[PDB]
Amino acid sequence: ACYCRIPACIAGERRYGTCAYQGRAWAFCC
Amino acid sequence: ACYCRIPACIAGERRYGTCAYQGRAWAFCC
Amino acid sequence: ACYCRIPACIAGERRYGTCAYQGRAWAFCC
Amino acid sequence: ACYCRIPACIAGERRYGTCAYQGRAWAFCC
């Protein structure tokens, strides 16, 4: 699955983009 | 976790954005 | 993490997009 | 599995596209 994470992805996940939601930029991570 | 859905996110989810694939726009729901 | 798979996502993976590589479409699976 | 890397893919991966996050562009590699 994928996640929107603040402030970065977590160990074992990779970043592929950015979620833009509630005035924050979240890492798009899977 | 987040999922692409049509027509809508499911009770309990938040629409964080939009996916695009197979000719369609999808709710991206986390 | 994410794979660009043909023909389908595998096992617990779900689709988030479409990879395109010189005319070939792949499922973006994560 | 696919990843986003600067400045290019690790030799052996194919460049399937471009990622954009954190204000930078990355090779999308699988």
UniProtKB/Swiss-Prot annotation, chains A, B, C, D:
Transmembrane segments annotated in the record for this chain: none
Residues that bear Phosphotyrosine: Y21
Record-annotated disulphide pairs: C2-C30, C4-C19, C9-C29
ADP-ribosylarginine PTM sites in chain numbering: R14, R24
Official protein name in the record: Neutrophil defensin 1
